[PDB]
Amino acid sequence: KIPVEADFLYAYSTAPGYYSWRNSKDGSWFIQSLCAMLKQYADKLEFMHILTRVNRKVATEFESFSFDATFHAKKQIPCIVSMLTKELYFY
Amino acid sequence: KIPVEADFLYAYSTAPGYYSWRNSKDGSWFIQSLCAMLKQYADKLEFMHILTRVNRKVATEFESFSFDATFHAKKQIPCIVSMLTKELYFYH
Amino acid sequence: VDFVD
Amino acid sequence: VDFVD
């Protein structure tokens, strides 16, 4: 038998408890970054390593810009939740 | 700047909402498996790939044995929660 | 600009 | 035997 919860991966855009950020022109920081990293690396890297690059890209290359000071200059880290039992290569 | 929640990894023994299993003689399934995989692969594999091996070991090699039928023949999957921004290698 | 979800 | 945490 295997567990019924095995072989799921939840790629969350943000850490538990937090807001997640979206740009009105370019889309959400997380999906922008996820698509860029899959485009660049899906033929070469295992999926958790792609998602770790996504974490770094969201964490380092984005910062909110808001006319509301309360919401300005804020940051985001995504949250990879893996119940996978094997490595995942898209090729 | 980086997020204040960045560079954390939470290696949970079990999925959200679930019991976690411990053997009275050999220790918990998760820690048994984690120590075994670190011993075998810390000089060979990146840490998330080690933890993926731990997930597979717990999921496939363990099943509860209990005199209580309601707690017998149950399974477990650990839960890797990564806010890491880089690959983690324990070897040089 | 950015908005929260 | 196995026990839950």
Place this chain on the structure above:
Amino acid sequence: DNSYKMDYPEMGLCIIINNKNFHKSTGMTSRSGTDVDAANLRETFRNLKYEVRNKNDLTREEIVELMRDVSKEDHSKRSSFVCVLLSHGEEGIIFGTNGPVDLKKITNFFRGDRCRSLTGKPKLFIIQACRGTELDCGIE
């Protein structure tokens, strides 16, 4: 075996749920930029050879019925399954256009005992949604 078998005849489905406009009763803002996300995802997973299905502005009832229906398909010839949710959210919750639905209700349809043709195959849920109202001020 250390790697998932990804050479079935089909990579699998990629379901994209794109919720942009919400009922006034919810008080939720329209999610400007999400169409850009949905199109980006469609092209990205097309290039990965997934069968992409884009759905727009689903109520919470329609989300559950879609996921139920998808989980009842025969995935025997598919390597994997991908679901992308773009919406408002709270911790553990994604919003239909008309109110909240528990993420667990959606993912439970694909449990190893409930979707047998995906047993042993990777089930990927990609979630762009808030998980609360905390803000990360960062550290220099």
Place this chain on the structure above:
Amino acid sequence: NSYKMDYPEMGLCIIINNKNFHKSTGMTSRSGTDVDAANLRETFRNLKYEVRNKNDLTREEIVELMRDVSKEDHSKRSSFVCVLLSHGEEGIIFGTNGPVDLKKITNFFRGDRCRSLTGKPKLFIIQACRGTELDCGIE
């Protein structure tokens, strides 16, 4: 890209091993956890971590220990590891005398609150229940 792991020290490995709980909590003794704690000590010793084993801490002692550790100078350490062996429920681990929110423990090491670990991997290894659901498996 990879974390810098060639600082002079790999870092601390804090192991909190809670086996015996106050009767008033109703929680069972965790037979087998001493095996885990010794396995972890040896495993992380072989990885060149400075291992500190702590046994049967109250909830107050867990918080004080974590606070104190987060106030150390980790400048010469590559990483930080904390292992929690106890009873638990979702979001919670138990001291010998009651619950502590996991977030209260991990917040001590936030990037803005433990500056000598900013940018370094902070690993929390958690052997504890997260609720009362059972996984019946599938053949």
